[PDB]
Amino acid sequence: QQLCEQYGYHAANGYYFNNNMWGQGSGSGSQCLTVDSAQSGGVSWHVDWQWSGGQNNVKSYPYAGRELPQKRLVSSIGSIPTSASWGYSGNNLRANVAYDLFTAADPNHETSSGDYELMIWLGRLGDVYPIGSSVGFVNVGGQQWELFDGYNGNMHVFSFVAPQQINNFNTDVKTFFDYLTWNRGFPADQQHLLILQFGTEPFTGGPATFQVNHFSGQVN
């Protein structure tokens, strides 16, 4: 499946993919997401892109996501085992590589995509910035991260950013949720987990390829 249109979309075997060129209007370029494998044990895919303009504007967030038929209360989730293997190539890369999760208390959350957004940046290429401000370094699930805290509209956004790129990553994402409820006031018995996604936010550069050798994730 080759997904070049702005919102070309594929789903199979419990995973979905979206080219997700939502910011294409803030610059110029092209992008195609190709699905290499989509199985119940995990997915494989890559996206090719070239992007220019809008120096500090995200052009897209191509991703694969785990299908979540029930939106579970974080306090009800035993674990979120996930595994990711990726690589980047191309010139002048300004992009990140990140897990993206969203939670909300009501299903009809009106003015935003979720009460909370939780990102985990495995990659940070070039001078690119998460939302909010640094609150320092924290240790979660066997790794040290720079935690960013901020708001994107109504949404409270927590970004755990790896100080050097992590190309092969295994964790339980519930431990990041635990960190947030023990230390940053996250209300675990009110927020339902809406989304578990993984991909790349390009800003500028290319011709580039973000290669996902393997992604898997579950909400248990």
Side-chain angles (χ1 to χ4, degrees), residues 101-116:
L101 293 81
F102 301 83
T103 74
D106 297 334
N108 63 317
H109 49 90
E110 292 171 348
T111 65
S112 71
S113 177
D115 290 341
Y116 292 83

Side-chain angles (χ1 to χ4, degrees), residues 53-220:
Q55 186 72 7
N56 287 311
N57 299 94
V58 172
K59 306 318 188 303
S60 66
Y61 198 159
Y63 55 70
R66 182 70 166 101
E67 296 172 12
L68 298 184
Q70 301 318 317
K71 316 298 183 185
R72 277 154 178 152
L73 283 179
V74 172
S75 67
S76 72
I77 291 166
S79 57
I80 310 183
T82 192
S83 193
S85 186
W86 58 276
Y88 245 115
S89 51
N91 303 318
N92 301 123
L93 304 184
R94 295 182 61 256
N96 72 31
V97 176
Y99 281 82
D100 207 16
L101 293 81
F102 301 83
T103 74
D106 297 334
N108 63 317
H109 49 90
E110 292 171 348
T111 65
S112 71
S113 177
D115 290 341
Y116 292 83
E117 168 174 16
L118 167 27
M119 306 192 76
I120 300 177
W121 293 27
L122 310 179
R124 188 182 180 186
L125 309 190
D127 52 340
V128 297
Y129 299 98
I131 89 126
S133 96
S134 184
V135 295
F137 292 96
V138 301
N139 209 274
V140 178
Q143 308 274 331
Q144 162 181 104
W145 314 86
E146 194 179 1
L147 176 55
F148 292 75
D149 185 343
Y151 282 84
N152 176 2
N154 199 12
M155 193 165 49
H156 202 170
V157 173
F158 294 114
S159 298
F160 299 77
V161 173
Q164 188 174 305
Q165 103 181 355
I166 311 177
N167 285 90
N168 302 280
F169 183 64
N170 308 281
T171 197
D172 173 7
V173 174
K174 184 66 193 306
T175 67
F176 294 75
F177 275 119
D178 276 336
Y179 182 83
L180 288 184
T181 109
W182 300 340
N183 299 283
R184 316 297 301 195
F186 176 88
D189 63 15
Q190 291 168 4
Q191 295 285 316
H192 307 93
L193 175 54
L194 307 178
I195 284 170
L196 169 67
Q197 279 160 13
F198 177 70
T200 183
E201 294 186 286
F203 291 74
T204 61
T209 295
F210 173 63
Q211 157 72 7
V212 176
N213 307 308
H214 176 89
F215 168 66
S216 66
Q218 307 285 354
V219 173
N220 290 322

